[PDB]
Design a protein around this ligand. Structure first.
Ligand SMILES: COc1ccccc1C(=O)OC[C@H]1CCCN1c1ccnc2ncnn12
Ligand SMILES: [Mn+2]
Ligand SMILES: [Mn+2]
Length: 362
């Protein structure tokens, strides 16, 4: 069983024994005293703890392999001239096939971000959006897969004009620095400081203007929990054994701060909201659809459309106003600025740090 071109075979079918490829495995950084953490690799008790969660890591690995195969495919065809809707639908069709989508047990972890230019995150087109990808666009492809709610959050930036090359390099270096710095017992603030230092060491020139690259200070890496993209720890307290993090950085030629802008596409149930009885029929129906199809995973309007829902906007506003669902509008820096992103998911296993979403690409 080999993968097709275009990819269509589920990752599950490529690996008969149910054992999926490990990501990049790394020794933890030396502790603050200077002594190595390499003892974790060979510790019999850490090995036992690690093995006790093998099922879980194996789920992340399956999801990461889908992510690698999907994004390699995307990079082969994404071109100016395509509509943003076309791009998102072609990506998502492939992701559903490779993840072997099955209700809440396997599927897409959150909508395909394809944020453009000064917009850094949380843009995906709604129905009727006529936006076309341009030669000069800088596009952040941020998409997620999951198996049993074990989420891969992983993202890269697409460009066609070499003028952004050094901006991309800066952000990639900053993200890799964050990944290198991460570790059990490492303070979240120290990971953030390392990211900032690296990113600010780059100066770039774009259309005759020079900039020192700025990290976006209100767009942070975060812990990841089961069915919970943001589990409550942010990378601006310590990282702990067994936690999972998205290490991400955003570089900007703008102010280095984002604000809500444009039409909202992304929504997600508040993880901490329980059962709320609703009588209003369209609102009740929409909540049921959300509970059945997404649970606490993020969704977008296009995903409601594809389920055959219509006339739901007022119902969706009602759920937002009730605090049951939260809106996540696009987050953008100033007009005319450029933003770039790279992101990986890392597992803080008892024995080592695994960049589970690492590929040959980034
Ligand atoms: C501090 O911001 C938060 C605090 C609590 C809960 C959620 C968020 C929050 O911003 O959640 C945003 C999620 C929901 C919509 C899509 N989105 C995505 C998409 C792609 N990659 C992502 N990495 C992290 N989130 N995220
Ligand atoms: Mn992401
Ligand atoms: Mn993230």
């Amino acid at each position: 069983k080999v993968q097709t071109d275009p990819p269509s075979v589920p990752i599950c079918d490529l690996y008969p024994n149910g054992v999926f490829p490990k990501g990049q495995e790394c020794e933890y950084p030396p502790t603050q005293d200077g002594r190595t953490a390499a003892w974790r690799t060979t510790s019999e008790e850490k090995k036992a703890l690690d093995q006790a969660s093998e099922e879980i890591w194996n789920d992340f690995r399956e999801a990461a392999e889908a992510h690698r195969q999907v994004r390699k495919y995307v990079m082969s065809w994404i071109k100016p001239g395509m509509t943003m809707i076309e791009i998102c639908e072609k990506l998502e069709d492939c992701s559903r096939k490779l993840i072997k989508e099955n209700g809440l047990n396997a599927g897409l972890a959150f909508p395909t971000g394809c944020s453009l230019n000064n917009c850094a995150a949380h843009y995906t087109p709604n129905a009727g959006d006529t936006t076309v990808l341009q030669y000069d666009d800088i596009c952040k492809i941020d998409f997620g897969t999951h198996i049993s709610g074990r989420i891969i959050d992983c993202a890269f930036t697409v460009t066609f004009n070499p003028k952004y090359d050094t901006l991309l390099k800066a952000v990639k270096d900053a993200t890799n620095t964050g990944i290198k710095c991460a570790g059990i017992d490492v303070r979240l603030c120290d990971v953030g400081e390392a990211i900032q230092e690296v990113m600010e060491s780059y100066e770039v020139e774009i259309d005759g203007k020079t900039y020192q690259v700025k990290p976006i200070r209100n767009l942070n890496g975060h812990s990841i929990g089961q069915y919970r993209i943001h589990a409550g720890k942010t990378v601006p307290t310590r990282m702990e054994e067994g936690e999972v993090y998205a290490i991400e950085t955003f570089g900007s030629t703008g102010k280095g701060v984002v604000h809500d802008d444009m039409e909202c596409s992304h929504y997600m149930k508040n993880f901490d909201v329980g059962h709320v009885p609703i009588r209003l029929p369209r609102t009740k129906h929409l909540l049921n659809v959300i509970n059945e199809n997404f649970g606490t995973l993020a969704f977008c309007r296009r995903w409601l459309d594809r389920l055959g829902e219509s006339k739901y906007l007022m119902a969706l506003k009602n759920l937002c106003d009730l605090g049951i669902v939260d809106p996540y509008p696009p987050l953008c820096d100033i007009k005319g600025s450029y933003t770039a992103q790279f992101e990986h998911t890392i597992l803080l296993r008892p024995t080592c740090k695994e960049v589970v979403s690492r590929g040959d690409d980034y």
